[PDB]
């Protein structure tokens, strides 16, 4: 029967149950130097 009260909102989604905490794909991209071969500007 048409229960005109439920409507098109029977679920909210207020979680995102992400129990698999990571950083990225297993490969270390966190490595870069050779910035300013000289010193600072005085």
């Amino acid at each position: 029967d048409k229960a005109f009260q439920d409507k098109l909102y029977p679920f909210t989604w207020d979680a995102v149950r992400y129990n698999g905490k990571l950083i990225a794909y297993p490969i270390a991209v966190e490595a870069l130097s050779l910035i300013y071969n000289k010193d600072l500007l005085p």
């Binding site: 029977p10 989604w13 207020d14 995102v16 992400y18 950083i23 991209v29 966190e30 490595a31």
Partner: protein, 155 residues
């Protein structure tokens, strides 16, 4: 186990926008004394709200914490909100839209915005891996078993 009754439906993106930003470096002038890869712990959150009939707005919140050793490195967080419009679907077909499909739209923006605040702190990149919100939505309720979209053909 699926029972996701396929329909022609109608979808629309009204507006995508960053609602909120946080970037806290409490150890900002202390962080150069920390030489390793930062131990980063991400958190994924959603807060939804219905604006109107057929029109809702779900907010995808991504939190980031980082620390080297036993002491903080940097903190960052973004909230990507989005106004969306739906027709045709209902029940599980509706729950799947705001539960998976809409976080999939919002995630690239929330993701890259964190890494763009990383640029501002002058330290190595922190870009988030692609999270399967869809598979996660299934893991929330084990297996898809819903059914719906009934022919109420009256005249």
């Amino acid at each position: 186990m699926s029972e996701q009754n396929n329909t022609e439906m109608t979808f629309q993106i009204q507006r995508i926008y960053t609602k909120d930003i946080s970037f806290e470096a409490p150890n900002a002038p202390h962080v150069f004394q920390k030489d390793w890869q930062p131990e980063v712990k991400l958190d994924l959150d959603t807060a939804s709200s219905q604006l109107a009939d057929d029109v809702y707005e779900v907010v995808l919140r991504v939190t980031v914490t980082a620390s080297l050793g036993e002491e903080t490195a940097f903190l960052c967080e973004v909230q990507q909100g989005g106004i969306f419009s739906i027709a045709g679907i209902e029940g599980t077909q509706m729950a799947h839209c705001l539960g998976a499909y809409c976080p999939n739209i919002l995630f690239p923006y929330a993701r890259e915005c964190i890494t763009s605040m990383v640029s501002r702190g002058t330290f190595p990149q922190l870009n988030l891996a692609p999270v399967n919100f869809d598979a996660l939505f299934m893991n929330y309720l084990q297996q898809q078993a819903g059914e719906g979209t009934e022919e109420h053909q009256d005249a």
